[PDB]
């Protein structure tokens, strides 16, 4: 939990930075190459992070919009994740390191904006939107969370790891 909308952006552009700083090093020819000991490359660790959060902004902007929201997406159910990560990867495929970076930059800066228009109550209470559900202990917060700060951290070990397996056992 976060006690606040500061300590949340806080903490997201924290784990934001050192992720991306991983990165630093890897060259672009080397974006889709695979270790047996990392489940994903590179190219994928960014793809994933740009799919999540232009999902997420999505659902809200949709919603406060008008548009109905059909989650995950319109054509991957909760069930067919494994899908719908795969549609992430397509979607950026042909961006070189340099420029997944690039966007990733500019899409963090939009999550960190997206979250400057949220209010405290919008953040912290339930059923506040339609989309985060009815469910105690998954307020607009806990969504953020578990598609930013979260990954972020989870996946810069995953880099780190893609990057000792480079050189050693």
Same mark, same amino acid.
């Given at each position: 939990?976060?006690?606040?909308?500061?300590?949340?952006?806080?903490?997201?552009?924290?784990?934001?930075?050192?992720?991306?700083?991983?990165?630093?090093?890897?060259?672009?020819?080397?974006?889709?190459?695979?270790?047996?000991?990392?489940?994903?490359?590179?190219?994928?660790?960014?793809?994933?992070? *740009?799919?999540?959060?232009? &999902?997420?902004?999505?659902?809200? /902007?949709?919603?406060?919009?008008? @548009? !109905?929201?059909?989650?995950? #997406?319109?054509?991957?159910?909760?069930?067919?994740?494994?899908?719908?990560?795969?549609?992430?990867?397509?979607?950026?495929?042909?961006?070189?390191?340099?420029?997944?970076?690039?966007?990733?930059?500019?899409?963090?800066?939009?999550?960190?904006?997206?979250?400057?228009? *949220?209010?405290?109550?919008? &953040?912290?209470?339930?059923?506040? /939107?339609?989309?985060?559900?009815? @469910? !105690?202990?998954?307020?607009? #917060?806990?969504?953020?969370?578990?598609?930013?700060?979260?990954?972020?951290?989870?996946?810069?070990?995953?880099?780190?790891?893609?990057?000792?397996?480079?050189?050693?056992?």
């Amino acid at each position: 939990e976060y006690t606040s909308k500061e300590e949340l952006k806080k903490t997201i552009h924290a784990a934001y930075l050192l992720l991306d700083g991983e990165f630093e090093g890897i060259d672009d020819s080397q974006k889709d190459n695979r270790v047996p000991e990392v489940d994903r490359t590179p190219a994928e660790i960014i793809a994933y992070q *740009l799919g999540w959060l232009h &999902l997420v902004m999505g659902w809200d /902007r949709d919603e406060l919009a008008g @548009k !109905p929201v059909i989650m995950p #997406a319109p054509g991957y159910k909760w069930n067919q994740l494994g899908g719908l990560y795969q549609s992430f990867y397509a979607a950026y495929a042909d961006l070189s390191l340099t420029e997944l970076r690039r966007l990733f930059r500019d899409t963090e800066r939009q999550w960190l904006d997206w979250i400057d228009t *949220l209010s405290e109550e919008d &953040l912290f209470t339930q059923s506040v /939107r339609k989309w985060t559900g009815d @469910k !105690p202990n998954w307020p607009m #917060a806990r969504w953020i969370h578990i598609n930013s700060a979260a990954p972020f951290k989870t996946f810069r070990a995953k880099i780190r790891k893609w990057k000792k397996h480079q050189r050693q056992a």
